[PDB]
Amino acid sequence: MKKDIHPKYEEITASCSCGNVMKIRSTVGHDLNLDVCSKCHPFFTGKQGRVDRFNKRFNI
Amino acid sequence: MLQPKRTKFRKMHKGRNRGLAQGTDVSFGSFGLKAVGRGRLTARQIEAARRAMTRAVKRQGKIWIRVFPDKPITEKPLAVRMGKGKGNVEYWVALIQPGKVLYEMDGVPEELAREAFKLAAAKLPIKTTFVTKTVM
Amino acid sequence: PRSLKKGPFIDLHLLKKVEKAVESGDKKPLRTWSRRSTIFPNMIGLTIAVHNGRQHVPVFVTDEMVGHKLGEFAPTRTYRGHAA
Amino acid sequence: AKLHDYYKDEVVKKLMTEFNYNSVMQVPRVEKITLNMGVGEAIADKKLLDNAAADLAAISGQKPLITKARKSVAGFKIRQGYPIGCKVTLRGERMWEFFERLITIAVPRIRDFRGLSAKSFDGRGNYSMGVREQIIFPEIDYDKVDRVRGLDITITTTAKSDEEGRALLAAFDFPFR
Amino acid sequence: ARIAGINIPDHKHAVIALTSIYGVGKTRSKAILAAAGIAEDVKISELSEGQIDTLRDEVAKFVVEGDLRREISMSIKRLMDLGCYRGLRHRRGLPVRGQRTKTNARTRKGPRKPI
RNA sequence: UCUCCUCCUAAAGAGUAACGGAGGAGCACGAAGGUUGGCUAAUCCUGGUCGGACAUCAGGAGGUUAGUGCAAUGGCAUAAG
RNA sequence: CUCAUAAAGUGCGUCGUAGUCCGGAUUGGAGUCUGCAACUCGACUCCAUGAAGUCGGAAUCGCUAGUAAUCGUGGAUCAGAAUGC
Ligand SMILES: [Mg+2]
Ligand SMILES: [Mg+2]
Ligand SMILES: [Mg+2]
Ligand SMILES: [Mg+2]
Ligand SMILES: [Mg+2]
Ligand SMILES: [Mg+2]
Ligand SMILES: [Mg+2]
Ligand SMILES: [Mg+2]
Ligand SMILES: [Mg+2]
Ligand SMILES: [Mg+2]
Ligand SMILES: [Mg+2]
Ligand SMILES: [Mg+2]
Ligand SMILES: [Mg+2]
Ligand SMILES: [Zn+2]
Secondary structure, eight states: OOSSSSOOOEEEEEEETTTEEEEEEESSOSOEEESOOTTTOHHHHTOOOHHHHHHHHSOO | OOOOSOOSOSOOOOOOOOSOOSOOSOOSSSEEEEEOSOEEEEHHHHHHHHHHHHHHHTSOSEEEEOOOOOEEEEEOOTTOOSOSSOOEEEEEEEEEOTTEEEEEEESSOHHHHHHHHHHHHHHSSSOEEEEEOOOO | OOOTTTOOOOOHHHHHHHHHHHHTOOOSOEEEOOTTOBOOGGGTTEEEEEEOSSSEEEEEEOSTTTTSBHHHHSOOOOOOOSOO | OHHHHHIIIIIHHHHHHHHTOSOTTTSOOEEEEEEEEEOGGGGTOHHHHHHHHHHHHHHHTSOOEEEEOSSOBTTTTBOTTOEEEEEEEEOTHHHHHHHHHIIIIITTTSTTOOOBOTTOBOSSSOEEEEESOGGGSTTSOSTTOSSOOOEEEEEEEOOSSHHHHHHHHHHTTOOBO | OEETTEEOOSSSOHHHHHHTSTTOOHHHHHHHHHHHTOOTTOOGGGSOHHHHHHHHHHHHHSOOHHHHHHHHHHHHHHHHHHTOHHHHHHHHTOOSSSOOOSSOOHHHHOSOOOO
16 A cells, blocks of 8 residues: 555544444544444344225225 | 448449359249449449340349449549549449349349340440359 | 215126126226216226216226226316417 | 354355255355446546545555556547556455445435345356445444545445345345335 | 434434434424423533433334335336436426426425526 | 649550549648557447446457557568558 | 404514515415315415515506595305406
């Protein structure tokens, strides 16, 4: 790697609100507070009619 | 009236017409009109012969024109002194050597093919004969 | 729209014709003038010719499409555009 | 390094069992990850290309190459030799760390996420995807942006076929739909 | 900070910050803050992380963003494929709820198109 | 039209004419020269954010169909690019 | 006796000049009333979205005092349906 031209790239900690703590080298500097990760996104976990509504609204 | 869509150059030398021809066999169809004399075939002459054939056969069968007029011929107008530049292109010819199958025909009986080729041979300026496809 | 407590509205002659068509199979299209009748689940798969002012437009009633009106289904104004 | 160790200990075993291979060298590897930005409005404002270079540098942790035009193009009014993009190439440790960052953090932050297309392979096993908004990477703070930009990501893989490439990414649990 | 995939404003009040979500208005924002037990005049910058997490839970209880957008698009496409009167009006880009078209109708008809 | 360059005519050494057929020049460059080290093209297909027939990225096919400061011819991979 | 709490105002707090906590058109869903029946083709309620519009060219209009301007209320017509009278 060339010297003195690359950005500062040191290891930080990212915490997600699902109780997750992970450590990654990154360039942002401070710690990270994440709204969602791969462990709590509904797509990753698996969390992702006319006659029916007619019968429900006009049951006889 | 046959003519190339474009060429590299507009004018060509006169050249010579020696030797005997290639493409001397009946290749696609069954009968052929083959040139025995040597000469040039104007695009107008080729067109007149083709029209006579197609009208004689009444648009059944298939007709192949085996020659193409790709050589331009120039002429000088009247009252122009000799020598002031090559003249302007007027028409296109196809040089013919003996044994050159000019036209060729399939899908028609032999007698009707002979009659159509006779009419077209009457329209052409050079000596022709009727030939038949041979197996080898 | 119609009140929920009054339920869905449908003409008696149309209801009887639909019932007869159900019990004796798919005949020729049911000719009707009732643009005011709502499509029920029981006439699924049926051809209803709704009067729209001069002709009877054929309608092919299916499942995903009940609960609306035959009047919605049969347009009344013929319009092809200005400057044509 | 985390996903690289994960590769070495279980992904090669999974692919061996899946495809009845004979060699761990035949078991495919992730070769490189190339990130590219086409910043073609540099012709109007060259300084915005420098902004995009700083953007890509902050995202990938690496100074980017400023890529220039291969040949002059009539419609887009660009000349040959004129800088119109930027690109980083990630190999080895930084490639694995960026790959972990992507699949763990940046992909779940995509606006309206429903999965990635499984048809995005180039017929040889290599994968390509697009990122519409670089704000999905947490390296870029929100109120310091000047223009919304994008980029595209190419995972170049030594696999021979599309089945092998998608098997490799699925073994890394890549969110395909 | 980040609610339902977008970054809400930070220097505004809680009700405006929550109604910045596509799918949350004033009434739903009051419902969110009432269910989270959070005063409506507290700004996002002075809101803590756990309060934001409860806000995320309540927003996830509601249906916002991409789910709402695709439901609206699916219903409109359902009408236009169905071919009712409203479907035809949606096809031609004209007012649907029976407004006049002899004059006005400019929201559906766009800018004026002179002959 | 008049001096100079390239092809053909020009008849397989050279040269060779016409108010014969076709095109160019009257410069550029202190790097576009020297040397050392390194590299290989055109085009098409597939995938990819804005990006579209065509910008930048990745892979394949292809094999010099590219390139040469400016015409045409002869050269060029050991590259002369 | 009912229709029928007038509103502007007043006091407090917030908003701090932004297409905004201005604007409320358009559209999706869920409803209520009247009427045999709200699709063409009613009104109103709730939720969701939030368009043009940042004071308007040439030109043109009303008003001399409880007037102009501005804010509410009622009636006729009418089963229901006023930004009109
Ligand atoms: Mg509302
Ligand atoms: Mg109306
Ligand atoms: Mg010689
Ligand atoms: Mg000689
Ligand atoms: Mg001599
Ligand atoms: Mg040179
Ligand atoms: Mg060298
Ligand atoms: Mg050199
Ligand atoms: Mg505007
Ligand atoms: Mg203002
Ligand atoms: Mg008034
Ligand atoms: Mg009254
Ligand atoms: Mg009334
Ligand atoms: Zn999480």
